[PDB]
């Protein structure tokens, strides 16, 4: 199906969508993240992380101390389904993953793990 | 003498001053912080923190983990001379401190410890 989405993240700490819908007829799904505005990654960086909805805040908390060099994610965090790098204004990244990782009957979300951003920057992923 | 100052902070991630001059006649000093613009504290909150210049980045890095409930400052941080709360648009806070705490010959600075702000939001405090 349509197996790719592009999400913008802003200088006002927001993603420009609240839901990522994944059609089940995709073996592989690609999320592209762009960052508009002009703020660099060390002041207003953003990544996009996909996990179980319950796991979003715990992943964020463990990422706090990993720092920007590890994309604010604890190295090898198994709760993470897929993630982009932390990007600043002007940059882009994408991550492609097996849609098969998303166990049906489960609730998944996406979020930014840059410290403090999760409170505003999260949404749902919906398998259809 | 004149032993108080008012500093504004903005949605554009700036203080409206780059130096806080403190008169030696002042046995105590009062810093008022205001926030103009319309962004809530969880997207563009600001505080004002005074410390030795050497300590500004290490303080901010420790603040990341402390969270907004701790004003993004490690609790009881010994390097912090004085600080306000994190305020959002429309709010105000002030902090008074003993000018005796500022060691003669040392270099001091003020910054915001809200995640990622420090690069944009710092200045000097001049003991005169
Ligand atoms: Cu972010
Ligand atoms: Cu700030």
Q: What is the DSSP string of chain B?
A: ---EEEEEE-TTS-BS-SEEEE-TT-SEEEEEEEE-SS--HHHH-B--EEEEGGGHHHHHHHHHHH-GGGTTS-TT-TT-SEEPPPB-TT-EEEEEEEGGGS-TT--EEEE--STT-TTTSEEEEEE-
Q: How far is A81 from chain B (nearest CA, A)?
A: 24
Tell me, what CATH number does A111's domain have?
A: 2.60.40.420
Kindly determine whether residue A120 and residue B43, on different chains, have CB atoms separated by under 8 Å.
yes
Closest by Cα among A108, A113, A21, A95 to A59: A113
Find the domain containing A32 and state its range: 1-128
DSSP 8-state secondary structure symbol assigned to residue A15: B
Closest by Cα among A39, A44, A22, A43 to A31: A22
Which pair of tokens denotes residue A49? 């992380």
Which pair of tokens denotes residue B81? 């001379």
CA–CA distance, B9 with B17 (Å, rounded to integer): 9
Kindly determine whether residue A115 and residue B120, on different chains, have CB atoms separated by under 8 Å.
no
Instruction: Assess contact for A120 and A23: CB atoms under 8 A.
Output: no
List the single best residue of A115, A120, A121 to mutate versus B (max B Cβ within 10 A): A115
Instruction: Tell me the DSSP string of A26-92.
Output: -SEEEEEEEE-SS--HHHH-B--EEEEGGGHHHHHHHHTTT-GGGTTS-TT-TT-SEEPPPB-TT-E
CA–CA distance, A85 with A90 (Å, rounded to integer): 14
> Which residue among A43, A64, A65 places its CB closest to the CB of B116?
A43
Q: Which residues surround ligand 1, an ion (CB under 5 A)?
A: A 46, 112, 114, 117
Kindly determine whether residue B42 and residue A119, on different chains, have CB atoms separated by under 8 Å.
yes
Closest by Cα among A61, A56, A85 to A74: A61
**Nearest bound ligand to the CA of residue B63:** 2
Strand partners, A100: none
Closest by Cα among B116, B59, B117 to B83: B59
Q: How far is A61 from chain B (nearest CA, A)?
A: 8
Which pair of tokens denotes residue B21? 């001059």
Instruction: Assess contact for A43 and A35: CB atoms under 8 A.
Output: no
Q: How far apart are the first and last CA of chain B?
A: 11
B43: chain A residues, CB-CB within 8 Å: 12-13, 120
Kindly determine whether residue B13 and residue A42, on different chains, have CB atoms separated by under 8 Å.
no
Instruction: Assess contact for A112 and A9: CB atoms under 8 A.
Output: yes
Q: Is A101 helix (H, G, I), strand (E, B) or coil?
A: helix
What is the count of structural domains for chain B? 1
**Nearest bound ligand to the CA of residue B115:** 2
């Amino acid at each position: 199906a349509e197996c790719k989405v592009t999400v913008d993240s802003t200088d006002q700490m927001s993603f420009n969508t609240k839901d990522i819908a994944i059609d089940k007829s995709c073996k592989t799904f690609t999320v592209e993240l762009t960052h508009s505005g002009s703020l660099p990654k060390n002041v207003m960086g953003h990544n996009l992380v996909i996990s179980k909805e319950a796991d979003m805040q715990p992943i964020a908390t463990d990422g706090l101390s990993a720092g920007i060099d590890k994309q604010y994610l604890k190295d090898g965090d198994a709760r993470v389904i897929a993630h982009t790098k932390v990007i600043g204004a002007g940059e882009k990244d994408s991550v492609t993953f097996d849609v098969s990782k998303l166990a049906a009957g489960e609730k998944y979300g996406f979020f930014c793990s840059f410290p403090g951003h999760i409170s505003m920057m999260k949404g749902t992923v919906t398998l259809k």
